[PDB]
Every structure is written in C-alpha cells, then in structure tokens.
Amino acid sequence: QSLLRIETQLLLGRLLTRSGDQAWDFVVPFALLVIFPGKLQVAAFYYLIVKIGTFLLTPSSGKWIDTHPRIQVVKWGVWLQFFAILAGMVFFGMLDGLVRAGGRESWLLSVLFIALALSGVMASLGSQITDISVGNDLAPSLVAPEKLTHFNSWLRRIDLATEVGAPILAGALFAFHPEQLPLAGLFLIGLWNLVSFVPEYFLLRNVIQRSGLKIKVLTSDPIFWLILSYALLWLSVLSPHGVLLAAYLKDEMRLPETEIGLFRGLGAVFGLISTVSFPYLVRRLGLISSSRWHLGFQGVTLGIAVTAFAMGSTASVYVFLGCILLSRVGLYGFSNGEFELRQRLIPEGRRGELNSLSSLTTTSATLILFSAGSLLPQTEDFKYLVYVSLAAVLLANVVFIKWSSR
C-alpha cells in the first residue's frame, strides 16, 4: 500500500497501453493498403470520417457523462475501446477476406468499411471518455506537487520510450506475413492492444476506490494569426508521426514496415533536440526569435526534402526522410514557442477561450488535409500533397513573420 508501489504499477500499466495504442494506430494505414493497395484514398477517407464521426459524437457523449460517477465512466470508456479494437480486427479480417474472394465490386465491401470506420470512431470516442474520467485535476488532487513533479518526470521518459519503441516493435510484428492468414501480424498487435487494456481498467479503477473524496465524484483579433501560422502546419503530410506518409512509404516506396517504424521512432528523438535548442535560442535571441528561427529552420529543411523527393533514387529517399527528421527539431521548437507565447499574452482566466479557438483551426486543417487525401486519384499522386505541405509550412512562416512584427 506504498505510494512508490502505486506509482510503479501505474507507470508499468501505462507502458503497456501506451505502446499498445501507438503500435495499433501505426499499423492501421498499413492494413488499409494491403486490402486496398494503390488506393491511398481509402486510408485518408477512413481517417476523414473517423475525425468527423468523432467530432459529431463528442458533444453528444458529454451529455451522457456530465452527471455520472467517475468509477462508471472509466468502466465504460476503457471497455468501449476494447470492443472497438476487437470490432476493428473483425472488420479487418473480413475486408481482406472479401477482397481475396473477390469481391471488391459488391456493395458488401462498402458496408464493412463504413462499419470499420465507425468502429474506429468508437475507439477514439472511448479514448476521450477514458481521458475525461481520469480528468486533468485528478492527478494533482491525489498527490503532493513535489511527488508529482518527480512522477511527471517519469511519464515523459515512458511516453518517449513508447513513441520511439512501439512503432519499431509494431513494424516488425506486422511484418509477420505468413501464407495464411497474411494479416496475422496485425491481429497480434490488435491482441497486444487488448491485453494492454485490462490492466489499464483495474489500475485506473483502484486509484478511484483508494481516493474516494480526494477527487470529485462526478465529471484578441491580432492573436488569431499566431494561431493560424501554427494551424497551417497541420496541413502538412511531411511527418514521421503522420499516417498518410507512412502509407505512401509502404505502398509506392515499398519500404519495409520495420524501417518505416524506425523512421517514426527517430522522429521523437529529434523532438528532444528542440528541448535543448529552443531554450538555448530563447536566452540568446528571444522567445519570438527562437520561434521564428525554429519555424524557419523547419521550412528550410523541408525544402531540401522536396528537392531530394524530385530526384527519386536510392540515395534521394535517404536525404528526403532525413530532412523530415531534422525538420522536427524546428517544428517541436516552434510548437513550444506557440504555447508559451499565448501564456504570456493571455491571462489564466480567458485561456480556455484561446485553446478552443486553436482546436477549431487546427482541426479544420486536419479535416482539410484528409479531404484532399480523399480526393486523390492514386498513391502516386500523393506527391501533390508534398508540395502543398511545404507551401503550407513556408506560408506559415510568412503568417508568423508578419505577426512577429508586434
């Protein structure tokens, strides 16, 4: 019944489920292009209706949680993801089974896909439900701020371990590919996700029962351009954490799933470089200049990436992907600058209004992005999203530089 015991358990429990989510969410675009090879539109349209279906059901779900005990909301959300991942695997096995019949001409296939995406909605919806029940003020209201700052120091390390490790572990397991079934690797990662959910439910439920009353029983116009220049970066496809690029690298580039996993894992590593560079430039150039020098550094590294992207050789793909990793240092740096600049220009009172406006602009860019992806002719035409991405980054510089004159 020691605090350190409770801490280590929750950490290990999070280690499994965070790796489970990261692995599963990384192999989804892969499984969508073995059922629909050459057709990236499916992957984009899948994520498009998942994003829309989640947004339209977010305020609808809030009314059925606002007056319910946290110990039940956890019971719902966690197991809601469990049955949504399971339903995802079922629809996946059927879609591959129907195409291999086959089988794509029937309207039966379209039904399975809509159902599949609907399942993807429930998984993300159940994820939100679990997050709200666990809340934001529940962690500080449970532990002293001195023992929490030590605890939060471990979370960053563990979340880093999953963001770097799980995509590599996923790409290896997904690369199973036996004679039958060819999606056995996907099913294992899906099972990985399920097994990692049952300690999550218990560890999050036991912490509620342990602390009954400690937590709650129930559950500027010129500042717009600063938001915009950050929201324009949500229009880009050039990211190791991006799903569209991962599908293009697996279908057209025909790169091994494991190296694509490594490529994603190395993305979080360059993110750490920003945690040293961005603070350095702040004390040396200024907060505003550091943001510009990071956003500018992002736009100049992505410029090289597109240049190498036009060559199309075994060496050019190495430079292309490499510059994308190098661009992360600038992105993560500018993204931090985005947050702190708002923390210095907006009081703690009306900070809630700002965060919501950003959640409207950035999400719009997300919808716009996958909408463009849903209008693609083929995976080969994904290149047109690459040039748009760089333009979105270069213009994001223009918008920020214009705003920086203040």
Ligand SMILES: [K+]
């Ligand atoms: K999990």
Ligand SMILES: [Zn+2]
């Ligand atoms: Zn201490």
Ligand SMILES: [Zn+2]
């Ligand atoms: Zn493969």
